[PDB]
Design a protein around this ligand. Structure first.
Ligand SMILES: Cc1ccc(Nc2c(F)cccc2Cl)c(CC(=O)O)c1
Ligand SMILES: Cc1ccc(Nc2c(F)cccc2Cl)c(CC(=O)O)c1
Lengths: 115, 116, 116, 115
């Protein structure tokens, strides 16, 4: 599991469950090609997005549909989503955990890059 | 100004100065049209990106070039940028301050939205 | 002023107004002496807590009463407060802006430290 | 495991390993009584701090020695520590994860409160 997305709801202090997450790889022509997606689970985590073979170096965008999450909860959000764009380098072995800490008018996203 | 971007360096506890900021607006055909861009100043602020006439409703994307920032300070950061995509002025004109707090592997983007 | 506290409500995307802020300084005997306190204003800022004469080196604690804040808005928040403990003016006088970004279960405290 | 502290280093995008964490319970006289402590592990996590029986309602302070962590890395930090003070309520069953996302001049701390 080279890439795991973790989403936390900073309003309820809970994992942000059932949050749509799309991953995209930047194609040569600078457009985003859908690559992987899922919904975060009960634990706010989205595993099994990609695999080691698939997850090659490149520029990836993780788009977290924070807005539907806030809509589902009835809280007016500021952002359309949360959108983590980063270069997977893979110079040494890497797991990437992208943790998005979400508030209606603020989000934080952190990469915990290990191995 | 209706749109202000502020950027802090959470490593140096400083304003993040000379950070490139690009603002786009989603056009009718769902492309991003270049809307405005600028550098944060010596206070980490980027004022005057736009005006209350120009800053109509729409979805805007603010791409703060955090990578060049960290790179110029010798850091290889995780993200290519800090993004902020939001619907602006949906229930009439607002002032938006987008505050981006930057660390090499984490950033936070907050909006202070006030009713002028 | 050498010490400014700014507090944002990340739920409402607003300044967090009328937030009680208490500043303490660690005395010789390692107790916290009350140093200064105030409310954030209508801009979420608390200026004039102290002066450059009064704001000597030491360890200071800033306790931002985030709980009363969230409680007055009907929210049961997680933390009793947002704290900031820091050594101030160790290598001469600095201006400190403490920016506290508040959510009911998360807060972030950042310092913008500039050399006047 | 009613209370788990997770510390992330936002500069290196790694778990913050070997970070001293002290937990205190507010005593009746308003002083902090040491209750539990540990060092975060390799995964940035500090488990086994307390137990269900021990972790009664009360006001707790989690003090994270962020400053020694930054010193160990040679980066001048702003804060003396990170200090999470909160009321354990236990109205329904709760695990508390206190995640501290640490930068030299910024920290974020979030409670993920589940069950
Ligand atoms: C009411 C208010 C809220 C937030 C900010 N900016 C800000 C922020 F939103 C997060 C971290 C640091 C800073 Cl400086 C500011 C601008 C400032 O005075 O630094 C004002
Ligand atoms: C239940 C839970 C809550 C939060 C986190 N992690 C986390 C993190 F890894 C970075 C920044 C904030 C947070 Cl909250 C985690 C750990 C993770 O799976 O990365 C678990």
């Amino acid at each position: 599991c080279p890439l795991m997305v973790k989403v936390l709801d900073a309003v309820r202090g809970s994992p942000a469950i059932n949050v749509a997450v799309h991953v995209f790889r930047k194609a040569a022509d600078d457009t985003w090609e859908p690559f992987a997606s899922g919904k975060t689970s009960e634990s706010g985590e989205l595993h099994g997005l990609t695999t080691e073979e698939e997850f090659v170096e490149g520029i990836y965008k993780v788009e977290i549909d924070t807005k539907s999450y806030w809509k589902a909860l009835g809280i007016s959000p500021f952002h359309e989503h949360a959108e983590v764009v980063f270069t997977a380098n893979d110079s040494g072995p890497r797991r990437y955990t992208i943790a998005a800490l979400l508030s209606p008018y603020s989000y934080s996203t952190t990469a915990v890059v290990t191995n």
